[PDB]
Design a binder for this molecule. Sequence first.
Ligand SMILES: *[C@@H]1O[C@H](CO[C@@H]2O[C@@H](C)[C@@H](O)[C@@H](O)[C@@H]2O)[C@@H](O[C@@H]2O[C@H](CO)[C@@H](O)[C@H](O)[C@H]2NC(C)=O)[C@H](O[C@@H]2O[C@@H](C)[C@@H](O)[C@@H](O)[C@@H]2O)[C@H]1NC(C)=O
Ligand SMILES: *[C@@H]1O[C@H](CO[C@@H]2O[C@@H](C)[C@@H](O)[C@@H](O)[C@@H]2O)[C@@H](O[C@@H]2O[C@H](CO)[C@@H](O)[C@H](O)[C@H]2NC(C)=O)[C@H](O)[C@H]1NC(C)=O
Ligand SMILES: *[C@@H]1O[C@H](CO)[C@@H](O[C@@H]2O[C@H](CO)[C@@H](O)[C@H](O)[C@H]2NC(C)=O)[C@H](O)[C@H]1NC(C)=O
Ligand SMILES: *[C@@H]1O[C@H](CO)[C@@H](O[C@@H]2O[C@H](CO)[C@@H](O)[C@H](O)[C@H]2NC(C)=O)[C@H](O)[C@H]1NC(C)=O
Ligand SMILES: *[C@@H]1O[C@H](CO)[C@@H](O[C@@H]2O[C@H](CO)[C@@H](O)[C@H](O)[C@H]2NC(C)=O)[C@H](O)[C@H]1NC(C)=O
Ligand SMILES: *[C@@H]1O[C@H](CO)[C@@H](O[C@@H]2O[C@H](CO)[C@@H](O)[C@H](O)[C@H]2NC(C)=O)[C@H](O)[C@H]1NC(C)=O
Ligand SMILES: OC[C@H]1O[C@H](O[C@@H]2[C@H](O)[C@H](O)O[C@H](CO)[C@H]2O)[C@@H](O)[C@@H](O)[C@@H]1O
Ligand code: NAG
Ligand code: NAG
Ligand code: NAG
Ligand code: BMA
Lengths: 13, 637, 175
Amino acid sequence: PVRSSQSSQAGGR
Amino acid sequence: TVEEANALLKWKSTFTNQTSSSKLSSWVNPNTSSFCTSWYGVACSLGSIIRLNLTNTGIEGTFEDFPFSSLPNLTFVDLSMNRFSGTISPEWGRFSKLEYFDLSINQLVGEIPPELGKLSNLDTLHLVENKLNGSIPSEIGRLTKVTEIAIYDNLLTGPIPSSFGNLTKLVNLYLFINSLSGSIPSEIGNLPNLRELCLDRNNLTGKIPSSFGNLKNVTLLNMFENQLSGEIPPEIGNMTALDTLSLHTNKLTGPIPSTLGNIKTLAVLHLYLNQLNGSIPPELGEMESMIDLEISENKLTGPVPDSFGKLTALEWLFLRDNQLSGPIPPGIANSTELTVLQLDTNNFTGFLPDTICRGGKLENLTLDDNHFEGPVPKSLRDCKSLIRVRFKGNSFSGDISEAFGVYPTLNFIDLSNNNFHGQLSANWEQSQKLVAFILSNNSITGAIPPEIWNMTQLSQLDLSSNRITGELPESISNINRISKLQLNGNRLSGKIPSGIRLLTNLEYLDLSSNRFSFEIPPTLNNLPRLYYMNLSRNDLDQTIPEGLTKLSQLQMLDLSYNQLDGEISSQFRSLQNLERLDLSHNNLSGQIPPSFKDMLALTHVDVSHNNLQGPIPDNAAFRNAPPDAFEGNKDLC
Amino acid sequence: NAEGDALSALKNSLADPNKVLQSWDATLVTPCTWFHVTCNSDNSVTRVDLGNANLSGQLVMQLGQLPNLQYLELYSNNITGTIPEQLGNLTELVSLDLYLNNLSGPIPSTLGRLKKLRFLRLNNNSLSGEIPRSLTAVLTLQVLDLSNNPLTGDIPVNGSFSLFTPISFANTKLT
Ligand SMILES: *[C@@H]1O[C@H](CO[C@@H]2O[C@@H](C)[C@@H](O)[C@@H](O)[C@@H]2O)[C@@H](O[C@@H]2O[C@H](CO)[C@@H](O)[C@H](O)[C@H]2NC(C)=O)[C@H](O[C@@H]2O[C@@H](C)[C@@H](O)[C@@H](O)[C@@H]2O)[C@H]1NC(C)=O
Ligand SMILES: *[C@@H]1O[C@H](CO[C@@H]2O[C@@H](C)[C@@H](O)[C@@H](O)[C@@H]2O)[C@@H](O[C@@H]2O[C@H](CO)[C@@H](O)[C@H](O)[C@H]2NC(C)=O)[C@H](O)[C@H]1NC(C)=O
Ligand SMILES: *[C@@H]1O[C@H](CO)[C@@H](O[C@@H]2O[C@H](CO)[C@@H](O)[C@H](O)[C@H]2NC(C)=O)[C@H](O)[C@H]1NC(C)=O
Ligand SMILES: *[C@@H]1O[C@H](CO)[C@@H](O[C@@H]2O[C@H](CO)[C@@H](O)[C@H](O)[C@H]2NC(C)=O)[C@H](O)[C@H]1NC(C)=O
Ligand SMILES: *[C@@H]1O[C@H](CO)[C@@H](O[C@@H]2O[C@H](CO)[C@@H](O)[C@H](O)[C@H]2NC(C)=O)[C@H](O)[C@H]1NC(C)=O
Ligand SMILES: *[C@@H]1O[C@H](CO)[C@@H](O[C@@H]2O[C@H](CO)[C@@H](O)[C@H](O)[C@H]2NC(C)=O)[C@H](O)[C@H]1NC(C)=O
Ligand SMILES: OC[C@H]1O[C@H](O[C@@H]2[C@H](O)[C@H](O)O[C@H](CO)[C@H]2O)[C@@H](O)[C@@H](O)[C@@H]1O
Ligand SMILES: *[C@@H]1O[C@H](CO)[C@@H](O)[C@H](O)[C@H]1NC(C)=O
Ligand SMILES: *[C@@H]1O[C@H](CO)[C@@H](O)[C@H](O)[C@H]1NC(C)=O
Ligand SMILES: *[C@@H]1O[C@H](CO)[C@@H](O)[C@H](O)[C@H]1NC(C)=O
Ligand SMILES: OC[C@H]1O[C@@H](O)[C@@H](O)[C@@H](O)[C@@H]1O
């Protein structure tokens, strides 16, 4: 199914 | 039908590698009495095929012999999730009544024909997860009735056609995984019904169009991982329906527009991995719906506004890798749902606020490489939800047994390079999930509590560069999951326990700069993963045991600055991977075994200040050795 | 980051029954806080100590994304598949230890780009082919072993291989 892109979280330390 | 059915049947003949268990076994009789009722995937109106649904059927072939001239009434076509190869024919634009066109998840190549623009009845166009290349034809802007376009995960190039401003009915535009180029067309800001705009992961250049302030219906705006430049237009604050705004991994510059505070519906804000500068606008505290706020890896400056205390629903706050300064306002940790607080790599000062874990939900807290000082707040001591705690590189202080409580969920903690004093509380044993306990370069004293060895899940333990006393027990064997053990630079005494034999997973051992007083355990011969062993600057008082030469994988071995005596066993020739040896400052006697010429991996040797004699075996390590590496011996030829 | 995503790719291609790779948390900035991985002062990965980990699976081409990776220890496992020629992208490189496995296929000729290579051990495997001439130009190689592998062809003493002894080529079915 066609979906929308999801923003990935920033890298953590 | 009979012409349609026979034309479809001719196209089915092209299919390759088709098994008899295929769904298309139902395509037998070309008469309408079975064509329009029993053929899988076809549906008729008034006895003519209007609907062709062959999703996920396992068909392998091409559209070259598709019966374009025979199916005038196609209005629903889904051929996704098959193994069709070839190109998209211009004939696809002949289906005058077509409303749904889906050829996603296939192996198509080539350009999208301009003839697709004359499907005046189309409502949905899906060309997803193919390998189509070229530029999007301008004629696609003729689809005045379309509401969703999805061409992502392709090889598209060139600009987005500015004719897309004519697609007034569009609500969803998905083009992300591609190689589109140029600036965003400003006409895209004038689509009245647009809701979702995903242009992320492209090669877009130029500024964000200021016309985007008109998109009063857009809730999602993904444009991350691009080459967008310039500054964030302040008109974006007029996007009063915006829910998620992601512009991360771009080349934007300038300050954050204070107009972000007008979007009361904004829940997610990703601006990280850019070049924004200036100070945090105090108006960001008015983003009432904010849940995930990420401004990491930027060039921001100045203090954090106290207005962050108004963000009552905040869960993630990413401000790491910036140049912010000053004290932390107590409003930062106000949120009871706050779970992640990343602040490392900055220039902050002062004390942690007492609100640090007010809600009892804080999982991850990072403060590395700053100028914090003062003691640990009481809310953080009693905060039981901690998972990762990073305090490295600060001037924190106080009693280490009074600072920290009990953390059943603690996974990783690094308090290194601080000013903690006192002796270790046995409370750490209750953190039964801890895998890394790193506490180097502090002022901690006392003995290692015995309960520490009952933390069976520990894989790394670093108490180096402290003033810890006592001696290591034989219960040391209880932590066999360990792989890094750093107790160097302390005042540990007594003999080295032979329980170190049973820590087989051990890669890296550092016990140097201590007061270990008796002979080396002869039973340390079963560490099949140890590449490093440092026992320097201690009081070990007898001959080097033969068991040491059986650890095949050592790369470095330092036994210097000891009271070691006896002869250098020639069985060190077995250490085929050994690159470094340091036996200096001992009482070793006899001759250096001439078998050492065969140690090709050996590059550095030091034998200075010993009682040896005789000529040196010739290898690369000895030849390049400086005069220091042989000083203070007796009769070395 | 880029190095962490590459090591994440390996983590997804290996079956890990012994839970060795658990610490490899992909959502971290760098993999330098992971276990069995050591970094230099610049947070670039220099070591991968995965020897004798009971890992099963196949290697991954993304292993060439570690420019500073000096020591790659994947020995003594049940890893299968081939050697991806992208390992020749390891510009800085000292030790290559892939011995005691179930690897198959040829020896990529791209390993001649690792001019810093000292130690290469690939014995006790199912490798098949001929030794590339490129391996003769590294001039840094000191220790070499391809025993217990069904290769073919004559022993390539093109200069650098002149110093090596038949134990390096024993049980190889070369000649
Ligand atoms: C778009 O891609 C077409 C397919 O080329 C190949 O597709 C896959 C099979 C894959 O192997 C991929 O790496 C290839 O690039 C190009 O058409 C093909 O071009 C090659 C030679 O370049 C030719 O041998 C094929 O017969 C031909 N097939 C078809 C169906 O056309 C497209 O044409 C290129 O565009 C020209 C402007 C030029 O760049 C030239 O190299 C090609 O003809 C590709 N169009 C692009 C890149 O705009
Ligand atoms: C370290 O632990 C051992 C045993 O581990 C635990 O023992 C129980 C207390 C319980 O928590 C189990 O789930 C663990 O396996 C301790 O030695 C045992 O102590 C109990 C007293 O409760 C006694 O009955 C046993 O005979 C002891 N020995 C063994 C082999 O079980 C030990 O005291 C702990 N050390 C410290 C410093 O706390
Ligand atoms: C199926 O297609 C046929 C062929 O185009 C349609 O028959 C035409 O119908 C239109 C009106 O819809 C007439 O103007 C044409 O003269 C017809 N031509 C022929 C050869 O019959 C038919 O109507 C279509 N059926 C449906 C349900 O759309
Ligand atoms: C086309 O065929 C697919 C499957 O052959 C249908 O997909 C199903 O649709 C219904 C309603 O959305 C769902 O309950 C099923 O779970 C779907 N199955 C899937 C996605 O595998 C689809 O509805 C068909 N469309 C038409 C117009 O007939
Ligand atoms: C941090 O704490 C609270 C937020 O919950 C703020 O203080 C008051 O909280 C109550 C909650 O019922 C509100 O009704 C009040 O309106 C809040 N005070 C004000 C002046 O608005 C507090 O302001 C927050 N921020 C800080 C302390 O900087
Ligand atoms: C083992 O650890 C000791 C420290 O306990 C290291 O000694 C250092 O040696 C260098 C070389 O001159 C000195 O500049 C440092 O001051 C020494 N450190 C201390 C604390 O005295 C030694 O290098 C280590 N061995 C190996 C092989 O890494
Ligand atoms: O026998 C332990 C007993 O005292 C605990 O406090 C310790 C103890 O006094 C020790 O001798 O000195 C430590 C400081 O160096 C104290 O922290 C105390 O917590 C008590 O509960 C416990 O039963
Ligand atoms: C938002 O979308 C709705 C859809 O029903 C539309 O009626 C409304 O006019 C749109 N808002 C605009 C164009 O400002
Ligand atoms: C959009 O925001 C700007 C601020 O940059 C403001 O001047 C303008 O009036 C806003 N739009 C409307 C329609 O008010
Ligand atoms: C901690 O480390 C720093 C630099 O690594 C050095 O000043 C010293 O070793 C320690 N200093 C303090 C204040 O603990
Ligand atoms: O608990 C399983 C999950 O754990 C996370 O840390 C990630 O590794 C996910 O990929 C995984 O699905």
